[PDB]
Each structure stands twice: as structure tokens, then as C-alpha cells.
């Protein structure tokens, strides 16, 4: 049952925040609805969930159009998969957030393809903080330069950072890696305006991510099976 699962995930988020002295409202639950059908998303919507993350552009755009045409208002769609230049226009035209900025060219394409009537597309710069098998995300040493370039794009809004750490079973390493991100996030927040989003943590490392300073957790399986 999707509604029961949302309540259970929101409980674990709330607990983890309270345990480390944070208000549960500091943590956004991003429901990863990739691979789940629109009908299941509609259950989640009926249970109050409003922010959904999609990994593939056409799947995501199809859901977005479906709920727009039902007249369901008030949703926030996050594109959280790797973005190819030949699918940027679809992201720029339909999504509210994109978590995977790791190249200036893709950010500029998104900016150019974003209709002017829409709010600026909220973007996070993706850091490859610890995963040698992934080619997604930049190194931290590239962050200052990329952030400065991205920040000038008027149809984008740089809101913070995202990372997908390498899989890790030890809580200690989960926390230390998440802290590296939180430190980078804090440093960015001092110089840049409206830095408020650290997209960090999934089901298996949710507690360490929240203890370290994440503002947004991405949960898929635990919600949609």
C-alpha cells in the first residue's frame, strides 16, 4: 500500500531529523517514481505527496503531461537522471528541478531551451564524491568554477548540490562521505545566493545523510515496491 509506505517513510525521516536535533521540516521527501506507473503516482498524490523524481526524460515527461491534463495542480517534478544533450529541451520545457548538472554545456542548453514564461529551472550541481565506477558528477575541485558559470544563467536557479555516493554499508563511511558534501554545501552557501538544497541520501544511508546535513532524501523502492 503506497499510502502506508509514505507514512512509514515520513516517520523514519522525522525520527532521524529529531534524533540529531533538526526539525523534520528541514528534510524534503523526494519520492522517486521512476519505473512506477502513473496510477501509482496518483495514489501517492492522493496521500499528499507532491514532489516526484524521475530518472528518464520521456517517462518523466509523459507522467508530467498526464497529471497536467487531469488538472492536478501543485506538483514538483525533479529530473534526477543523467541528462543527454538531445533530451535537454524536454527537461527544460517540463521539469521544475534538475539535480544532475555536471557540465556547463548542458546547463547552457537547459537555459536556452527553457521557455521564458516558466519559473527558472532549479538546478543542483552533481558532485561525484566517492564513486569510481560512475562518470556522473564533477570533482569538488571543479565546483567553484562550474558554480560561477552556471550561476549567471538567467533561466536557471542554482540551489545547491547533489551526490550519489558509491554504495557503502558502514555507517561511519556513509557519514564521513555525506559530511564532505555538507562541508562543500556550507562553503557554497556562504558565497552564493539562495543555496538551500543538499540532495543527498536514499533509503540505505538516509540516517547518515540527514545527520550530516542533507535537506532532501530520494526514496523510491520503499514507497512504490
Numbering used by the authors: 3 to 227
Pull verbatim passages from the article behind this deposition:
The pyridoxal 5′‐phosphate (PLP) homeostasis protein (PLPHP) is a ubiquitous member of the COG0325 family with apparently no catalytic activity. Although the actual cellular role of this protein is unknown, it has been observed that mutations of the PLPHP encoding gene affect the activity of PLP‐dependent enzymes, B6 vitamers and amino acid levels. Here we report a detailed characterization of the Escherichia coli ortholog of PLPHP (YggS) with respect to its PLP binding and transfer properties, stability, and structure. YggS binds PLP very tightly and is able to slowly transfer it to a model PLP‐dependent enzyme, serine hydroxymethyltransferase.
We serendipitously discovered that the K36A variant of YggS, affecting the lysine residue that binds PLP at the active site, is able to bind PLP covalently. This observation led us to recognize that a number of lysine residues, located at the entrance of the active site, can replace Lys36 in its PLP binding role.
